[PDB]
A paper describes a structure:
The arginine route involves three enzymatic steps: (i) arginine decarboxylation to agmatine by arginine decarboxylase (ADC, EC 4.1.1.19); (ii) deimination of agmatine by agmatine iminohydrolase (AIH, EC 3.5.3.12) and (iii) hydrolysis of N-carbamoylputrescine (NCP) to putrescine by [name] (CPA, EC 3.5.1.53), with the release of carbon dioxide and ammonia. [name] enzymes belong to nitrilases, and more precisely, to C-N hydrolases breaking non-peptide bonds using Cys-Glu-Lys catalytic triad. The octameric [name] enzyme is assembled into an incomplete helical twist, made by four tight dimers with swapped C-termini. As in other nitrilases, the substrate hydrolysis is carried out by the catalytic triad, composed in [name] of Glu48 (proton acceptor), Lys121 (proton donor) and Cys158 (nucleophile).
Numbering used by the authors:
A (entry chain G): 7 to 301
B (entry chain E): 5 to 301
C (entry chain C): 1 to 301
D (entry chain D), E (entry chain B): 4 to 301
F (entry chain A): 4 to 188, 191 to 301
């Protein structure tokens, strides 16, 4: 059993219809190169608006139900027979989430995951927009594979990757929007970013796909212009954490890698780390401060 | 710029003759409509006297089924004629169950369904617990032609949980038909300021406007222990999304209160303030207890 | 002076002996229904499986084939004519065949002759003399109420009368009077068993707890059935009765006479009393999930 | 006649409005029961004072006390232990801002086995309990005592076949109901005593378990917010057997100590053979989780 | 060839009227099966005593015992753990006032994995089980053991294609049915043994899963409420492969230990290839939720 | 010996790839069954030609014909009326965009009582039938004939206990299964597996069961060249305990005959008690494919 996976990497305008056209073009290119599952970067419908903390930007969110972009990519998924996770800004009554809908290769909406770990600070004021997610970590049975899909900042947390692996994830996927930080040009996070994820692939023995944005974006914030340069470096890592495919920090790209899932599942079983785990000794992971279990 | 809705609170006196009272309600709904109202709110159990001063066998038989209710049917025609949303408070019989209920009539005349009062008051003057099963619909929101609304009934208005329950389900405006006044056993009790402050609190905590329609007049009821009298204190009002009173009636005048709200701007304001973003349902399990320790079954 | 307002309904319990010939027993039933109507009855209740002997003392292959379809049943059709002629409601107990299922059933015939539908016995008894579990699928209609020309009524069958759940289910759905056609007597394996006082008390409790009148019609006479292991005899103990909404017996027959019991109820006064007593206002269904278990712990599927 | 035997007792007495006097009365009659061989002794509802629920008064709510270190429960634990008798203790419970009509079950070694909180709360003239008590949130309970597994509910609960069935399904071998019922002050023509008995006899017969009801006697005048209100409590404390037969009964004015012995092994065998529990149809009982016969409650 | 192999066994013996004797007989035959390589061993229905259901007797109901701390289950857990063998244990369960014909599945490490309660209850002369057992309320279950996911149901359940299909759908790799079937005391012309085998062979073949049936032998006479009643149990315990072929079978009168090995990975692959499960039409099977071919049950 | 008696027959023959010839063969064998007293006679599946269904050829699709005015059905109606026999007629149905593997039930007076459309269609490696047939949408049916209430299902339907139970719950007194099964002239021989599953249905439902299978070798040229199947016959009739009462071999024409007392069998079915004892409250999992999620 072999599945072909793709990371896409492109620049966005602040127009939904242009960006969706761009995603469609790169999804067809992926499909043309053999892709069964194609990963589109985080909040690709527009500019990464979380540089600002603005009332009007919250109203960019849309219900999960009858979402125009999801609906449009469901047609594309269906035509091509590819699996397409769709990053979007969800409104759910008065709650708001950074969410992702998993469309199967028959175009079926398989359900959503809501971003669990919400980043904060200059350039990435996501805590202002999003309730911390309440779906918990999830795995989706698609026509090709059980996949673990989480979102951007979730990729820094070994807990997220481990939870998806424990629930049957054969591949992990992280749509991303990370770049420079507007308050401090000396912060270059790209190597650190890659290393943490490489760690998750190696610790769980599962391949991993990260799709990140490129281009410079200037946002009109409540305190004036703020600029981020997104550094791309979209990549696909194998089950021991080796980078098999990688983009640069400036050019549009379509990454492709094939994995033998039944072989990798045998290596995983045979390595035996899941049977060697000591959940009896991991209670402290349910604390924040190293002592008090959360309610 | 944005969806506007004009809401109205009515305030009037009742006899114990249904036809008279429905006629009074119609006159005032028409008057609200003439002043631009899209949703009009009539006070609790308006079809007669506030009979719950007594605990009487014969008064339980004032209840009628929800199905083919002559007062709901009559007000459905008016709703349709005028293009206004009309919540209709009534005493519901449902086989051997009885409830203090409200049917939400949409602006096309459609009966959108019912809510059954959840929190039932008790004590001299207000012996509701004798008459009504505690409601079993739970808190509801209704999609009307003009807005998603949350409607609850009188005593429900004291409970922050009801208001929050409706808001979490997308209610854009909260409505509470009311019957509250003096208390026949103790003339020193004057609850009007307390009553208003608690509702203002709900409007401000959920960032939604709130409408409260209360009775006026003195009513004398024969009870098992002789006459009992309540002076209903009016003070019907409409509050905006920070809990500010935008319109209020006094304690004796018949009144038609009118207010317009921009539901898109308020939505935007509600979200921006951030309370719904910041709620901690993981820490709210104690709210599912009565005694602060034991969760109910 | 005017008498007190409200819908009055006159109900009747019949009590008679059966042969094992269908034509004879239907003739007996018609005779007693007519006598009940002559005494003012609006609703008349015939005992369980009146078409024949209480054959359930045996577990026999050939007795299963006494069952007949509900559709075009000759006894139901005949009693429909009588109901229409007299203007009386008549529930008709019969052994139902429904493809390969079999039930102990009752068809409710309205005062205009209309077949309102059926109830299938839910609780099926077992044991020497009363081997009903061999014959009947447990019923699958659930507890029902029927709107007749005179009243909304709840009808269940024999062993159902021991279950408070059945009486409450019918009352919660607006039953104004409860009816139980019965066949109960001695038990052939042990002559010390005399259940008649126990039997009455349980049903009196239903009437009192739901504040609705209750009618029980039971068989009389001795019947001997040829069983797979020899002859078996039951003496049916009569004691048909009508109870009011506090569980008081307003009329009762003895253990051997043929009887036509008659009582009038003001259903509007009773409804008022039922509601004022307050039990239905005070019920706690949030605490009753355990009733959906058999063993006090595990909810059934 | 082999089998585990248990002797139960219903007590019936008049109350003053002084706790000390009523607790002394209860102790006297518990000792009289024990002298007659009783293993489990049932004291009537809210026996610490007058039946105060004729009134709806602010100050009466403050008669409530916490379950923890309750002076009357602690005193009766001493007696339970001294005599080797099981004693359910009815009390008015405060639990932060909630209030309940409650009963603590004291085992024959003095151990406090836990509480049941009254589920069905009556209302109306003379019996304004809904003003005082949150509807109970323990659900129906059974308690394993030294002598038997028992089901204890409280007064108005005794009208509900659901409560009796719920306790029996959980293995209750005997049902107990402390009571306060009498005349009704707004209508002198109401005499509920025969109705009250018939409904409980029904529960005993339907579940094939014995049942004990202890009820108050005497006239009580309460100063209500609208003037004097009077109830004459009608006694009629009784013990019913597993077919609903009254085996012992008190009249409507006498102080009484009723006594009956039950063979719990034989009764268990009878209950099972009669077959009602074998034949129940919980798949058809979902309408019991409605109030109106149609909508399941949340 | 390659893949997870499992050795299963059907045991067949005659019962005495003494519980401990009968458990010792079971232990002896379990040990003999283990010696021949068995991983999962099936003991016949209600093996602790005579098949008492010929009678409808009050005292026989009290032969039931709770699942909790059941002395026969506890004893067989020790054997399971000692030998590393999976052992389903048939017993007569008391659960407050409910009673069931039940089976506890003991894993090869001695762990009590839970119980299944007999769903379909037979009736008629000689087999009056409806008098004793509530219809089961666990539903059909599959248990994950150290060696396989197994589906265990009980005697009469074996006539119902629905039970076997329910277990296969939930992952059962082997079906097991402890049995007590023989002659019928009211009609000596009834010989059901060929019919009995054919129906089970049909389940194995329709689901492509092996099937194990363990039945009693011996003549048993029971004192019924109407005199002596005799059943001659007919043995014919057997093991069927995934196309329904009988691979091992006992006769109608001797003790037997039957043994068969199955390659569960090859059978699984063969079942997936055959594709019947992906070809099923559940959208057309709603009539199966009726008894009468028309009205769905509640 | 009292009660309604019905004589049923299973026919078995080799198909040529010529329609007239095959219908002539069917008529000859129906007449022979009638001569031996048969009241209801079962002809094997798709008997008008070679079993084309696993060859995936677009030109074979035009063999389908509408249910309305079907020349083979209309001809067998005449035969049914002439002889006073019930004849289920297997045919390849064209229904607008859809195509089905279907069977029309002809009563003893020649009346067309209706159609059943094969429900279970094998898809995945080895079985490419979807190329020709849509999954049936009639659901499982019973038909009241002059002699009996009967249930009929087709070929692959044979493997599914649900179809047999569904028919019996609705009052079918006899089950009929026209089939076509064989193998590559391979090691696996499915004939015993097949019989055991069917004997299971008869025994579990306490109804007799009639199965008609073809014989002979058939060669079809396909996209992937010549495919050959040897059909293994073994048509049979089973009684209500699953006992085989007559059976054909794997190479000759056969006319199998058996008489059933439908009143006695009904009484036996009811007394055995399985239908009294069924637990539909516990069967919801059967409305899933994966053992957890109900289908729409
Ligand atoms: C996505 O937007 O969560 N990446 C967050 C990066 C935060 C860097 N300080
Ligand atoms: C409406 O009737 O619920 N108002 C109740 C007020 C109670 C005052 N103590
Ligand atoms: C009717 O037939 O159900 N009465 C059942 C009585 C059973 C007595 N043990
Ligand atoms: C106890 O106190 O609940 N008694 C209730 C009686 C109410 C009479 N209508
Ligand atoms: C086990 O006891 O279920 N076998 C029942 C057989 C009944 C025979 N008619």
């Amino acid at each position: 059993r072999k599945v072909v996976v793709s990371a896409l990497q492109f620049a966005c305008t602040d127009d939904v219809s242009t960006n969706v056209t761009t995603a469609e073009r790169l999804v067809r290119a992926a499909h043309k190169q053999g892709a069964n599952i194609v990963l589109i970067q985080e909040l690709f419908e527009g500019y990464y608006f979380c540089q600002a903390q603005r009332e009007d930007f919250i109203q960019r969110a849309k219900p999960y139900k009858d979402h125009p972009t999801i609906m449009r990519l469901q047609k594309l998924a269906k035509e091509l027979g590819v699996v397409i996770p769709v990053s979007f800004f969800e409104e759910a009554n008065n709650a708001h989430y950074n969410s992702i809908a998993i469309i199967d290769a028959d175009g079926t909406d398989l359900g959503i995951y809501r971003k669990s770990h919400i980043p904060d600070g200059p350039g990435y004021e996501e805590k202002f927009y999003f309730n911390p997610g309440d779906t918990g970590f999830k795995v989706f049975q698609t026509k090709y594979a059980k996949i673990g899909v989480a979102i951007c900042w979730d990729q820094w947390f070994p807990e997220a990757a481990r939870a998806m692996a424990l629930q049957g994830a054969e591949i992990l996927f992280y749509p991303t929007a990370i770049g420079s930080e507007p308050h401090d040009q000396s912060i270059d996070s790209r190597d650190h970013w890659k290393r943490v994820m490489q760690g998750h692939a190696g610790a769980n023995l599962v391949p991993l796909v990260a799709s990140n944005r490129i281009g410079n974006e200037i946002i009109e914030t409540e305190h004036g212009k703020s600029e981020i340069k997104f550094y791309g470096n979209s990549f696909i890592a194998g089950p021991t954490g080796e980078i098999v495919s990688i983009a640069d920090d400036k050019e549009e790209a379509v990454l492709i890698a094939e994995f033998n899932l039944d072989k990798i599942k045998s290596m995983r079983h045979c390595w035996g780390v899941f049977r060697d785990r000591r959940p009896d000794l991991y209670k402290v992971l349910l604390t924040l401060d190293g002592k008090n279990p959360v309610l």
